[PDB]
RNA sequence: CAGCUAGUUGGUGGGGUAACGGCCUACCAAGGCAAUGACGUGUAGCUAUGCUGAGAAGUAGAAUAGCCACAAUGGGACUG
RNA sequence: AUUGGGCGUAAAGCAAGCGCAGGCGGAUUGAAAAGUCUGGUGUUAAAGGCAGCUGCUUAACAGUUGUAUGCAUUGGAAAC
RNA sequence: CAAGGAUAGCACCGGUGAUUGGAGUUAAGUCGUAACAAGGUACCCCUACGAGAACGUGGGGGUGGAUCACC
RNA sequence: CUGCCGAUAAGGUCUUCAAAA
C-alpha cells in the first residue's frame with residue numbers, strides 16, 4: 067500500500083526552430099507509512115506518462131526510515147542548496163505541524179508528531195531534498211552506543 | 222617519543238582542539254598533535270571517558286619547559302568516526318554563562334556538553350546531578 | 363558582523379511609511395499646527411472633476427477628482443462607480459485605496475454617505491457602493 | 498438560527514444525519530452535489546484546505562453549531578495535560594440537545610433543540626433552557642411530566658431504539674448517560690483528527 | 702547637534718530651611734561636565750500592564766491601580 | 782539575523798600603509814573573589830498571566846488558592 | 862525681591878514667494894542611432910576639452926573583449 | 933583587405949486537468 071501524492075506539477079518548455087516544445091513535470095512522493103519513502107521527478111509530453119515514469123523512478127530509489135515513539139529523535143537541520151529545513155522532536159499529540167512539500171514527506175514516511183519550519187527557499191525539490199537529507203543524517207541511540215561503548219543508551 | 226616537525230597551536234584554547242578534531246575526522250586522519258594546556262588536558266580526559274577518542278597521551282620535553290598533547294581518534298573497523306559534529310559555545314569575546322535551570326541537552330543526551338562549573342570540565346548529566354552549572358565550552362555529538 | 367561592532371553601532375531598523383499619508387494629518391486651525399494622528403477616513407471638498415487614462419494595458423476613461431480634505435492636503439481621488447453627481451464644487455467622504463491604472467491616485471470616495479449620492483441600479487455587492495435594499 | 502434546507506447541505510457533503518432519511522427521501526434518490534453544476538468532472542484532488550474545510554463543516558453541521566462556538570470549545574479543550582484525543586470527542590458529544598436526540602425522545606436533532614429552548618427538559622437538580630450546556634456523565638437528566646401527554650409523545654416514548662452510551666432505564670424515562678461514546682457510535686460521517694490541526698492554525 | 706557651564710566647581714565665617722546642601726550671603730581661589738556623547742534640536746507623563754510572538758522580544762502606554770504634574774495664562778503669600 | 786544573514790561573478794572589503802584609545806590574546810605557580818555558580822533572609826504593591834476550584838441555567842464574567850522576574854545583603858565553591 | 866510693560870540686537874525653526882533648475886509618470890509626437898554580435902570606430906572606469914542630443918577625442922587603467930592560433 | 937550600410941506605431945492568444953482505467 068505505497069500511497070503516492072503529487073507535490074508539484076510544473077510546465078517546462080524548450081524552444082525549437084518555431085514553436086515551443088511543452089512537457090509536464092511531476093514530483094511524486096511514495097510512502098508505505100511504515101518507514102519506506104522515496105521521491106521521483108519525471109518529464110513527459112502528457113501528465114499520465116509523466117506520472118508513471120515519476121512513480122517508477124520514486125519506487126526505484128526507496129530509503130529506509132526509523133521512527134522513535136512516532137516522532138523524530140533529535141532536532142536536525144537539513145541543507146540542500148539554499149533551502150534549510152528545521153525538524154524538531156514533538157510530544158505525542160501535536161500532530162504534524164508541517165506544511166507543503168515537507169508535510170507530504172513526513173506523512174508519507176510514517177512520522178506523526180513533528181515540528182518543522184522552512185528557513186530557506188520555497189522550491190519543492192530542494193525542500194524535499196533538505197527534508198530527506200535531515201532525516202537521513204539522523205543518529206539512532208543504539209549506533210552511538212556501539213560507537214561510544216556505552217550501555218545501549220543507558221545514562 | 223620523538224618528532225620531526227614544529228608544533229604550533231592557536232591562541233584560543235577550546236576551538237584550537239576543536240579544529241584539530243574536525244579536520245582530522247573530515248580528512249580521515251587519526252593521529253594529531255598540539256600544544257598541551259591544563260584546560261585542554263582536562264577536556265580530553267572527559268572525552269575519553271565518554272568514548273569519543275581512543276587514547277590521549279600528554280607528553281613533556283626533555284627540559285620540562287614545554288608540553289604537547291598528541292591524541293588519536295577512535296575509528297571503527299569500517300573507518301567511520303564516532304564524532305559527528307563539534308560546535309563551540311563560549312567563544313572569545315562573548316563568553317556563555319548559563320545557570321543550572323538552563324543547562325542545555327545536546328541531541329536529547331546523545332551528544333555531550335562540556336561545562337566547567339567549579340571543579341574543572343564536567344559533563345552535562347553529572348552537572349545536572351550536582352544541580353550546579355557554569356561555563357559551557359563546546360557541544361560534541 | 364561582530365559583537366564589539368554591534369555594541370558600538372547597534373542595528374537600526376528600516377522605517378515604515380503609510381499608503382494614505384494625507385488621511386493622518388489634522389489641522390487644529392486655532393494654532394495652525396499639523397499633528398500626525400491616524401484616522402480611517404476623512405471628509406474633503408472636490409475642486410476639479412474630469413477623466414484620466416489608465417497606465418499601459420488598460421484603456422478607458424476613468425473619472426478622477428481633485429478633492430481638498432478638511433486638512434490642507436490636495437489629493438486626487440477616484441470616484442469608484444458608474445456615474446457621478448460631482449459638480450466641480452461638492453463635499454465628499456474619502457476612504458483608503460489605490461487604483462492601479464492611474465498613477466498618483468491613492469484614495470477612494472465612499473459612495474452614498476453625505477452629499478454624494480448612492481449608486482442605484484445595483485443589486486450585487488451593494489453594501490460597498492451604498493444602495494438601499496430593493497425590498 | 499439554522500439552515501432550512503438540510504437536504505441540500507447533506508446532499509452536498511454526501512453524508513446525512515446517520516439514518517439516510519435526508520438521502521433516501523421519496524424522490525429521485527439524488528446523490529449529486531446540488532445546483533445545476535452537479536453532474537460535472539473534476540471530482541477528486543481536493544486541496545488540503547478544500548477537504549479540511551469541507552470536513553470541518555461536516556463536524557459542525559452534524560450538531561447545528563456556529564463556528565465561533567466551535568472555536569470556544571477548542572480553546573477550552575486544548576489546554577489540560579497532553580494528547581487529549583479522548584476528551585474533545587466527549588466534549589463535542591456532550592451537547593444537551595444532542596443528548597436528548599440520542600436519548601430517543603425526539604424525532605430529529607434540531608427538533609430536540611426546539612424542545613430544549615421551549616423548556617420541556619430538566620436536569621439532575623435544576624432546569625435547563627439554553628441548548629448548549631456541557632454535560633458530564635452521571636447527571637440524572639430526567640424528562641418533563643406535562644410533555645409526556647402532548648400530542649407528540651408517541652415516537653418520543655419509543656426510545657427502545659437507543660445508543661448504548663445513553664442509558665434510560667426504559668419506561669421510567671430517567672435518561673441518564675454513562676460509558677462515553679466510542680468511535681463506533683461516532684460513524685464515518687466525520688471520523689478524522691486533522692481538523693484539530695486546522696483549528697490549531699486558525700485558533701491558538 | 703562639539704564644546705558647554707561664572708552660583709557653575711571648592712573652602713572659610715554667617716543667615717535661612719522640618720533637615721543636609723551656593724539654598725542664600727561676604728571673602729578666598731578656577732574649577733566642574735564632555736567623544737563611554739556634554740550641550741542643542743525634536744518627541745513623550747513614567748510604571749504595573751493591553752495586543753502580538755515558539756522564544757528572544759516588537760508595539761500602545763484603552764479601562765482600572767501606584768507615582769508625578771496641572772486647574773483661563775504668569776507670579777506672591779496668609780491660615781494650617 | 783545576540784538567539785538568527787551576508788560582502789569573487791547578485792547590495793556590500795575603504796587605494797594602500799604607520800598607527801594611540803577600544804576589543805581580543807602564549808604556558809605554569811600563589812592570593813584575593815570583580816565577573817560565573819550555588820544556599821539562607823528581605824523585597825519586587827493590588828488587579829492582570831498560567832494551573833485548580835466555586836458561583837451565576839453552562840459560558841463570557843466574578844471570586845478563590847497556587848503560580849514567577851529582577852535587585853540588595855549575607856554564607857560558600859575556585860574550573861574559565 | 863519680583864510677574865508684567867517698553868525699548869534693542871543676535872540665535873533656532875516654520876509657511877509663502879514673481880522667476881528659475883532638474884526629476885518621475887504618462888498606448889501609438891519630432892531629430893538622430895549611442896549600447897547589446899567584432900553593434901559595424903571593441904567595450905567599460907577616472908579625468909580634461911568640445912558639440913543639437915545620444916555622445917566625439919586626448920591621457921592613464923581593466924578584460925567584465927570577438928577573431929586568431931600552436932601536436 | 934579594409935567605400936558606404938539609417939530606421940521598423942499600441943495591446944494582445946494557445947494549454948485544458950489527472951481524478952483513472
Ligand SMILES: [Mg+2]
Nearest residue numbers: 082083084085
Ligand atoms: Mg529559422
Ligand SMILES: [Mg+2]
Nearest residue numbers: 711712713723
Ligand atoms: Mg562651601
Ligand SMILES: [Mg+2]
Nearest residue numbers: 397744745746
Ligand atoms: Mg504632550
Ligand SMILES: [Mg+2]
Nearest residue numbers: 754755756758
Ligand atoms: Mg517570530
Ligand SMILES: [Mg+2]
Nearest residue numbers: 762763764765
Ligand atoms: Mg490607562
Ligand SMILES: [Mg+2]
Nearest residue numbers: 746762763764
Ligand atoms: Mg488616557
Ligand SMILES: [Mg+2]
Nearest residue numbers: 782786787792
Ligand atoms: Mg541575505
Ligand SMILES: [Mg+2]
Nearest residue numbers: 790791792793
Ligand atoms: Mg557588487
Ligand SMILES: [Mg+2]
Nearest residue numbers: 794795796797
Ligand atoms: Mg582591496
Ligand SMILES: [Mg+2]
Nearest residue numbers: 793794795796
Ligand atoms: Mg572597491
Ligand SMILES: [Mg+2]
Nearest residue numbers: 797798799800
Ligand atoms: Mg602593523
Ligand SMILES: [Mg+2]
Nearest residue numbers: 800801802803
Ligand atoms: Mg593598543
Ligand SMILES: [Mg+2]
Nearest residue numbers: 232234258807
Ligand atoms: Mg590562557
Ligand SMILES: [Mg+2]
Nearest residue numbers: 749825826827
Ligand atoms: Mg504583583
Ligand SMILES: [Mg+2]
Nearest residue numbers: 829842843844
Ligand atoms: Mg477575574
Ligand SMILES: [Mg+2]
Nearest residue numbers: 891892893939
Ligand atoms: Mg528617427
